[PDB]
Amino acid sequence: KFPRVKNWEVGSITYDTLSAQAQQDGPCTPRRCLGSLVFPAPEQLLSQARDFINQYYSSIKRSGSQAHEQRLQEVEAEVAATGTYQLRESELVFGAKQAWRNAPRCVGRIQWGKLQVFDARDCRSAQEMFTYICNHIKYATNRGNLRSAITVFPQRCPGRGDFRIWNSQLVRYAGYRQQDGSVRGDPANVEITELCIQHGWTPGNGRFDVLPLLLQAPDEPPELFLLPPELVLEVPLEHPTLEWFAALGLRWYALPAVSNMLLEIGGLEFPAAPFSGWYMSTEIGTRNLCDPHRYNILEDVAVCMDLDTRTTSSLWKDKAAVEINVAVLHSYQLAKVTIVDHHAATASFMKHLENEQKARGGCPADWAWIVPPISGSLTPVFHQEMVNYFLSPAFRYQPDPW
Amino acid sequence: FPRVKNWEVGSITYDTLSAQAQQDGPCTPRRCLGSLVFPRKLAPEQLLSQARDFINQYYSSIKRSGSQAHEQRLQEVEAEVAATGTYQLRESELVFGAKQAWRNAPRCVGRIQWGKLQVFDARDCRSAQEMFTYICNHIKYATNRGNLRSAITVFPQRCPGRGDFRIWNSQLVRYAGYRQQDGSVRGDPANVEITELCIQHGWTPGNGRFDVLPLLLQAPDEPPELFLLPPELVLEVPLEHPTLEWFAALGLRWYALPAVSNMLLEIGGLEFPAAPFSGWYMSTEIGTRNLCDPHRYNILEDVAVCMDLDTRTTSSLWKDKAAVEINVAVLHSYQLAKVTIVDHHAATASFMKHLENEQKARGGCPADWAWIVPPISGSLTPVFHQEMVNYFLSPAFRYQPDPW
Ligand code: HEM
Ligand code: HEM
Ligand SMILES: Cc1cc(N)nc(CCc2cc(F)cc(CC[C@H]3CCCN3)c2)c1
Ligand SMILES: Cc1cc(N)nc(CCc2cc(F)cc(CC[C@H]3CCCN3)c2)c1
Ligand SMILES: Cc1cc(N)nc(CCc2cc(F)cc(CC[C@H]3CCCN3)c2)c1
Ligand SMILES: Cc1cc(N)nc(CCc2cc(F)cc(CC[C@H]3CCCN3)c2)c1
Ligand SMILES: [Cl-]
Ligand SMILES: [Cl-]
Ligand SMILES: [Gd]
Ligand SMILES: [Gd]
Ligand SMILES: [Zn+2]
Ligand SMILES: [Zn+2]
Ligand SMILES: [Zn+2]
Predict the structure, then answer these.
(1) Pocket test for ligand 4, best of A16, A346, A383 (most atoms within 8 A of CB)
(2) Which of A26, A163, A320, A394 could form a disulfide with A153 if both were Cys (CB 3.0 to 4.6 A apart)?
(3) Would strands B12-14 and B3-5 be described as parallel, antiparallel, or unpaired?
């Protein structure tokens, strides 16, 4: 009773034996599927640890060995003495890559083995935290030739508060409410904008103002840090044939760096471990610029394209959306900033599924997030059945610290 | 009671209808199988319990529970089963059940129309030639010279032992799929299997790329016979593009009527292996799936060449550009031919309205996100940012085996 999985474009059939090792539970039952939902002491800690150590010593082709049982013994002992334990640096690097490998909504996982892991577990203050983060952005950005990286700040521990980054990403544009009641800038960031302001930030008045970082050291209020402007690489948006497009004044930033998730490794939790890769072009063109509740530029673009916005059957929305994505891809290519289109991304993810089926006998994947938000059935992932389940190590959502 | 959020507007509801479900779906707390096309794979004490439930919701809907003529229908059904083991549906229950099965179909985006359904009762049928005449009435009525009307024809229910009425084609109108020299196909690769059962039962093959296949109708026990569809009864649309002069030269056509003829209508514990239903097309069905799927007519590159697109790099979005124009041509061609069609923007906006209606009426609506979101421009439609709950209600259209 392993789930049969078929690709309907090709006829391929595989069975997902890895789903049976699903170490935690999701929102569905045989009664009802909730898959489309966005948001779905020593004893428990010890069994998560053993399982991880077992994964680690499996990875280095040394399972059941002297060093393996030694480490198992050491951890049980350390959990007894201290209520927790510390990862070796090599185990941390393995745990970070596994968390990415296990991330079911990530279409970029072909890259999972090429992750740069910065060990900031010795961080002591928000000021030091800032320095680490500035170094992360600099290395990952690499002048436009982007590299995947994660920085791990100290784990959660009894008796002390968490390191937390309040910003959902290291680079975000501000969202300012208006007299029209409207939002100027990115409506997704209204809340964090208001927090920065009341923590002493002097707001701008533009549409693409980079937000400061609110960094929280254990048992301190958050501290405001401005990003040096020369650290935040940005791409002005132009279209290769639509010359008035450059006159919209649109821009986006190079580095997508998610900073508000919790990294979990062997029962240990790291509430602050921001990670970054590079953008797939629909994230910018379709979601960030075209969503009605984001920058919502679609109608303004279609009107300038001289399209008939009076009826839906002319597909003015689809035509304007495609050209916005073309503009994104062309602009990042022009600027020499890494970018991947959804055709290339989904093709590599299909190679990733093949690799994972041989390696682990399956691959956790969230169809609704893996299939891009435009041209879905034109990509190979559309016709591929997928099994969604939760493996550890893992990135998890966590509540906002405020 | 699942919380259900719309991330575009921020509105919240609670799906209370989900609790009243349950033919068991495929998901478990440890793994979601929501993307699987077939939920896994395919002494009558429980016939009564399914009939009582159905009868109860028929009288619920007509303001008529607790007094009444519903207690009397309750007893005639159990006397009927106590006597013959099965039972016959009143004609209005049959109408009510057919509409409820459509209303309950999680994968159907067109359900705002679920109240306008023409139900032809064909249970007194007994010959495959009769069937062909029923099917021919339906098609004629449903087509209505291009002003399509939703319709289902309900054939005799499966009964203890005996045999099955069964249409063998997957739809009433299907184009031919001829394998070949290369192991390649001319026509529709989706219909290769049935194109060969047609010829192995006596059909003379045809031209190629757009040959309406003949019907394979199976009366109980008796083996299936072939029937030719009159070209007068099969309305078709030549595809042309409003501004791309050469598009008509590609010789593309599609048919007017989508009529699913292989699913099993189940009402109150009764099974109807032959109950073809029909509506009208959403344009992405034709242009995106049927014409552009790599395993269907696979025309994307041909159109891209004619548009002189940069097919040498994926980042030109030449697939995306070509695909939109094929959809523009589908819509324009149906409109010019005055054949009812609906685009995915209009269709999903109507579905959002359906969701609002269903929340007031029944406290929710089973919906399959992966099938409700259109196959192109998903996030541009209002259903993309709408969370949905999938579950099985009865009456339903179910998948069923294939008599091969
Ligand atoms: C290197 C290139 C990468 C690409 C192209 C990529 C792509 C994506 C995309 C497209 C999504 C969400 C679907 C969407 O927004 O349309 C996503 C989600 C995600 N990615 Fe990747 N990613 C990359 C690197 C990484 C790295 C380095 C990590 C962690 C080490 C990671 C972990 C995740 C996680 C956890 C999610 C889900 C986030 C959430 O649910 O909020 N990704 N990725
Ligand atoms: C009248 C206009 C109708 C429209 C526009 C429509 C549209 C659709 C679409 C678009 C799908 C599949 C999703 C996709 O391919 O993207 C679908 C599936 C379905 N529809 Fe509707 N439909 C209509 C009428 C009907 C009627 C009259 C019935 C039944 C009486 C029905 C029952 C179903 C069922 C059972 C499915 C699922 C089929 C399967 O699982 O293979 N629909 N419909
Ligand atoms: C490292 C990385 C690279 C990349 N190229 N892309 C991403 C995904 C960015 C992203 C995409 C989304 F679609 C939504 C979010 C925020 C998700 C919040 C909302 C609900 C739960 N978490 C972030 C991450
Ligand atoms: C993962 C996935 C998601 C989605 N949203 N859609 C699909 C394809 C649905 C589909 C459409 C068709 F048009 C035909 C088939 C298979 C029919 C074959 C199998 C047996 C007999 N005929 C499947 C797959
Ligand atoms: C009445 C009606 C109107 C309309 N406008 N559209 C449809 C949908 C036709 C359709 C769409 C699909 F996407 C797949 C199928 C058949 C595939 C089989 C294999 C597995 C499940 N069904 C049929 C039906
Ligand atoms: C049903 C559905 C399917 C899908 N495939 N995608 C979505 C949108 C998911 C999404 C993307 C974003 F980019 C941002 C959010 C909300 C983030 C809010 C919550 C808390 C803080 N910000 C949600 C919805
Ligand atoms: Cl983003
Ligand atoms: Cl079809
Ligand atoms: Gd131009
Ligand atoms: Gd060319
Ligand atoms: Zn599920
Ligand atoms: Zn969106
Ligand atoms: Zn398809």
Answers:
(1) A383
(2) A163
(3) antiparallel
- CB nearest to A30's CB, from B27, B34, B380: B27
Closest chain B residue to the Cα of A16, Cα to Cα? B31
Domains of chain B by residue range: 15-123+150-160+264-278+348-372, 124-149+164-235+399-403, 236-258+281-346
Active-site annotation holder among A238, A264, A283, A356? A283
Reported resolution, Å: 2.0
Superfamily of domain B124-149+164-235+399-403: Nitric Oxide Synthase;Heme Domain;Chain A domain 2 (3.90.440.10)
Domain made up of A123-147+162-233+397-401: CATH architecture: Alpha-Beta Complex (3.90)
- Please give the method by which this entry was determined: X-ray
**Secondary structure (3-state) at A143:** helix
Question: Which of the residues A36, A37, A348, A374 would you substitute to probe the B interface, choosing the one with the greatest number of B C-beta atoms within 10 Å?
Answer: A36
Residues near ion ligand 12 (CB < 5 Å) are: A 287, 291; B 379
Tokens matching residue A132: 């680490």
Antiparallel, parallel or unpaired: β B185-187 and B215-218: unpaired
State whether residue B259 is helix, strand or coil.
strand
**Bridge partners for B175 per DSSP:** B212
Distance B109 CA to ligand 2 centre (A): 6
Beta strand pairing call for B341-342 and B281-282: parallel
Distance of alpha carbon A217 from alpha carbon A196, whole angstroms: 16
Q: What number of other Cβ atoms are within 10 A of residue B251's Cβ?
A: 10
Which residues have beta carbons under 5 A from ligand 13 (an ion)? A 377; B 289, 293
Chain B hits for A22, CB-CB cut-off 8 Å, are: 30-31
